Amino acid sequence: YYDIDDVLADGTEFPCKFQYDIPGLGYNPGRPITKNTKLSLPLWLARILAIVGPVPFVELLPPDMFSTKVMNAIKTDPVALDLHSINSHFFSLAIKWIMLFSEKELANVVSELLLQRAQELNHHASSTSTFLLKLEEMEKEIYKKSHESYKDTKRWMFK
Amino acid sequence: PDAVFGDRVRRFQEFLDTFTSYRDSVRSIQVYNSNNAANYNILPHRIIISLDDLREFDRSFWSGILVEPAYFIPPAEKALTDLADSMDDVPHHPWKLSFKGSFGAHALSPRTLTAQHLNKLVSVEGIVTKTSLVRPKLIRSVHYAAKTGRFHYRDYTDATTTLTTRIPTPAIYPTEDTEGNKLTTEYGYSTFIDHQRITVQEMPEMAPAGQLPRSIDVILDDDLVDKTKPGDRVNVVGVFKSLGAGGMNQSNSNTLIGFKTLILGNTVYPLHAARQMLTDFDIRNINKLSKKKDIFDILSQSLAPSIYGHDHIKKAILLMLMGGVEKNLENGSHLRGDINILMVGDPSTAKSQLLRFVLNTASLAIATTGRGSSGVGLTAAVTTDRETGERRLEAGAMVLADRGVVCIDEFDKMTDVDRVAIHEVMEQQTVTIAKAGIHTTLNARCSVIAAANPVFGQYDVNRDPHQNIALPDSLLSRFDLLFVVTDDINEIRDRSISEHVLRTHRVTIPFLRKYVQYAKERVIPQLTQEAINVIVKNYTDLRNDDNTKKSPITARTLETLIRLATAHAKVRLSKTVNKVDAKVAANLLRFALL
Amino acid sequence: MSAALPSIQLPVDYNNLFNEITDFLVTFKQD
Numbered sequence: 001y002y003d004i005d006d007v008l009a010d011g012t013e014f015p016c017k018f019q020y021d022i023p024g025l026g027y028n029p030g031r032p033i034t035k036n037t038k039l040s041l042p043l044w045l046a047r048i049l050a051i052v053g054p055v056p057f058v059e060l061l062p063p064d065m066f067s068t069k070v071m072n073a074i075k076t077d078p079v080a081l082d083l084h085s086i087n088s089h090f091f092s093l094a095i096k097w098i099m100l101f102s103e104k105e106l107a108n109v110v111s112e113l114l115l116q117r118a119q120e121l122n123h124h125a126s127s128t129s130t131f132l133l134k135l136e137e138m139e140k141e142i143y144k145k146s147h148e149s150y151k152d153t154k155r156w157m158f159k
Numbered sequence: 160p161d162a163v164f165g166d167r168v169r170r171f172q173e174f175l176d177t178f179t180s181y182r183d184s185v186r187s188i189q190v191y192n193s194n195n196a197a198n199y200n201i202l203p204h205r206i207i208i209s210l211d212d213l214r215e216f217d218r219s220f221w222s223g224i225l226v227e228p229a230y231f232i233p234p235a236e237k238a239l240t241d242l243a244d245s246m247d248d249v250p251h252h253p254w255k256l257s258f259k260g261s262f263g264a265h266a267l268s269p270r271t272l273t274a275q276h277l278n279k280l281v282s283v284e285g286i287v288t289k290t291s292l293v294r295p296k297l298i299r300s301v302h303y304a305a306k307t308g309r310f311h312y313r314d315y316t317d318a319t320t321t322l323t324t325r326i327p328t329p330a331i332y333p334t335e336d337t338e339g340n341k342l343t344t345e346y347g348y349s350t351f352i353d354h355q356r357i358t359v360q361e362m363p364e365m366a367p368a369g370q371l372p373r374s375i376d377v378i379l380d381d382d383l384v385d386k387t388k389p390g391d392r393v394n395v396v397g398v399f400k401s402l403g404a405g406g407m408n409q410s411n412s413n414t415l416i417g418f419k420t421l422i423l424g425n426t427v428y429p430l431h432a433a434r435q436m437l438t439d440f441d442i443r444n445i446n447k448l449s450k451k452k453d454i455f456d457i458l459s460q461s462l463a464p465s466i467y468g469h470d471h472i473k474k475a476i477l478l479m480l481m482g483g484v485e486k487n488l489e490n491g492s493h494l495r496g497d498i499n500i501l502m503v504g505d506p507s508t509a510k511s512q513l514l515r516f517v518l519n520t521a522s523l524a525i526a527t528t529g530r531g532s533s534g535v536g537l538t539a540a541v542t543t544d545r546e547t548g549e550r551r552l553e554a555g556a557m558v559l560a561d562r563g564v565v566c567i568d569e570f571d572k573m574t575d576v577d578r579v580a581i582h583e584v585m586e587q588q589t590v591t592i593a594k595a596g597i598h599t600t601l602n603a604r605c606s607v608i609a610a611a612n613p614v615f616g617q618y619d620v621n622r623d624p625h626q627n628i629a630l631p632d633s634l635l636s637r638f639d640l641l642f643v644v645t646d647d648i649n650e651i652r653d654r655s656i657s658e659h660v661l662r663t664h665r666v667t668i669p670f671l672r673k674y675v676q677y678a679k680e681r682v683i684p685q686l687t688q689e690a691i692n693v694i695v696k697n698y699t700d701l702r703n704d705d706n707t708k709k710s711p712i713t714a715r716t717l718e719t720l721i722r723l724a725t726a727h728a729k730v731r732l733s734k735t736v737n738k739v740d741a742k743v744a745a746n747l748l749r750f751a752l753l
Numbered sequence: 754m755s756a757a758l759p760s761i762q763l764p765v766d767y768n769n770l771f772n773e774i775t776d777f778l779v780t781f782k783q784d
């Protein structure tokens with residue numbers, strides 16, 4: 001896979017911090033960054049920089065609004081919910097989170113979500129101000145190729 | 160009630176683990192009420208059940224609270240009242256709920272109605288603008304026969320039980336029960352409760368413009384009365400309810416609606432988009448951010464990140480917005496402890512840009528726009544009968560300006576009515592009127608922000624600098640700072656302007672508003688015997704250099720020269736009037752006067 | 754009548770106060 005969709009989904013962010021002091025600064029003078037300083041981190045370096053040490057350099061600070069404030073909101077009613085304004089991609093961000101951290105608690109809570117969300121998208125597939133379409137934003141690859149299945153299958157079935 | 164009670168019974172054994180964490184909280188709040196009142200020489204009965212703890216291990220007991228919430232609330236009362244005496248009864252009011260949590264897409268903006276969740280739970284936000292009366296109302300009296308010395312007991316139900324459809328009891332005092340005793344009633348042993356009708360508008364920003372703002376109304380109870388000022392971003396959630404008879408009354412009720420939509424609710428929440436809590440950490444950072452000798456200059460340019468310069472203006476706004484103190488004279492008239500600045504400028508020079516972004520960080524200071532109507536600081540006896548026979552003086556725009564700021568535009572472009580209106584309310588802190596009713600001296604601590612334009616084009620240099628707009632100089636005497644915004648052409652100025660309008664199409668604000676709303680509650684020095692010595696030298700020269708220069712000054716301008724430096728020490732957060740404050744107050748006037 | 758016309762067992766009557774008004778004859782000679 002030459003990753004046509006997901007490296008931009010890995011272009012997103014994380015707030016995190018340090019454990020040591022490095023003069024490698026590109027973020028602006030005063031090149032040794034003082035430790036325990038909160039820094040915005042892109043996915044690509046920070047996925048492996050929390051691996052290379054024993055004790056790694058960076059500190060994984062969890063964006064716990066993706067862990068407590070919406071985990072009950074997605075527990076309530078998965079028929080109309082913000083999956084979108086908090087994450088332009090909920091999915092692979094949930095995937096690559098759970099590899100490094102490996103928490104089985106929220107590993108259950110999206111397994112209930114996806115069948116319920118797709119329970120709309122099957123039976124909703126028979127045939128606006130600034131952002132407000134976004135309830136239907138992270139579903140585009142998910143159902144639209146199934147929409148062309150039901151479209152043409154009628155067209156052979158009729159005249 | 161046999162079969163309609165077993166699931167009520169099964170809940171009574173169920174949710175006792177849900178208040179494993181609240182069975183302390185229900186009793187700890189009332190043991191000191193049994194200790195404050197027993198040792199005088201106070202709280203209502205509020206039991207915040209989180210929706211999570213009920214959702215976490217119950218489904219059928221949970222699903223009914225968001226589908227049919229009409230059989231299920233006096234269950235949770237009935238378990239709650241017997242777990243108060245069984246906790247505490249030995250020392251010799253039903254503990255109704257508050258019911259906070261999340262809801263999962265029931266943020267129905269009342270521009271939209273429901274078609275499916277009628278008579279259900281609903282979360283509603285908006286602004287209130289009605290604020291009707293307060294009036295008690297019985298629930299139960301206690302009759303008494305004087306002969307044979309024995310009491311009686313009777314409850315009278317209304318549209319306040321919220322859920323059951325009771326046969327109404329439209330009796331006021333049923334006297335002469337089945338005996339020959341002239342009945343009495345110990346009204347001190349009776350019990351009472353109050354009502355308050357309030358209508359809520361729509362927050363007029365997320366409602367797309369195809370309609371005016373609509374409104375519905377809510378009836379609340381004793382716990383949360385006198386909590387909502389008119390002009391607060393409130394958030395309420397209660398049941399949905401229709402009442403009244405309609406359509407099938409006795410005759411001739413054609414094309415007449417008969418279902419008054421109401422809300423009987425709980426948990427009125429203010430929001431901010433006074434509640435700003437802060438830990439030891441952030442309160443110590445602002446102590447560490449009180450340390451530098453530059454913070455008055457850093458806070459100036461960290462305010463409006465779109466416009467160049469005007470650092471005399473940019474310091475003046477933050478100096479005004481935090482405000483200065485007024486030591487009221489004991490048996491004497493207090494002076495003008497407010498501060499009221501003014502601007503004027505040749506047009507399209509951002510003189511109106513910075514007047515409206517103060518409203519986002521207003522800290523409950525909602526301003527008007529200055530439309531030519533009487534009602535800027537009055538009522539003019541608007542009563543609307545106050546439900547058939549009562550007269551009230553409903554406040555226009557001074558119940559909101561108290562300890563806040565306002566801003567109005569187009570001063571010269573008004574009629575004569577506002578000119579006499581701002582006359583009294585500036586020299587006097589209050590207003591009093593008997594329009595059709597009674598004189599009443601209601602107070603208001605307010606401060607204006609002005610804006611006006613010169614009439615004769617580009618003439619601010621070729622004529623008198625004074626008498627320039629000819630609105631009455633009583634207001635000019637009652638104001639101090641009259642900035643004249645210059646817009647002369649410098650080839651590096653406009654070149655720098657041309658890029659800063661391009662880099663705006665894509666130390667911070669919430670830390671800034673927390674700083675002032677913490678520094679509004681600390682000490683006030685007022686005293687240094689030599690900082691008062693330098694300023695009178697700093698005035699008497701220009702008191703002899705007032706007519707030999709452009710502007711004449713008055714004696715009340717001396718009360719400015721303390722008041723600016725008074726709040727300037729409030730930026731320092733120190734209990735001492737320093738010396739450095741008598742240098743910023745000098746040159747700020749020196750730009751306003753030269 | 755029925756329907757909760759029998760009141761509660763109130764420990765505070767007025768006959769226990771009534772005789773404690775009959776004692777307000779001449780006994781308080783101080784004032």
Ligand SMILES: Nc1ncnc2c1ncn2[C@@H]1O[C@H](COP(=O)(O)OP(=O)(O)OP(=O)(O)O)[C@@H](O)[C@H]1O
Nearest residue numbers: 465466467505506507508509510511512513612660
């Ligand atoms: N001196 C200035 N520096 C930077 N930007 C400016 C300046 N004057 C105007 N602007 C730009 O003009 C826009 C709006 O100006 P504004 O409408 O506030 O003028 P105004 O104060 O209303 O004039 P008037 O009150 O005379 O109509 C803003 O987006 C602002 O960027």
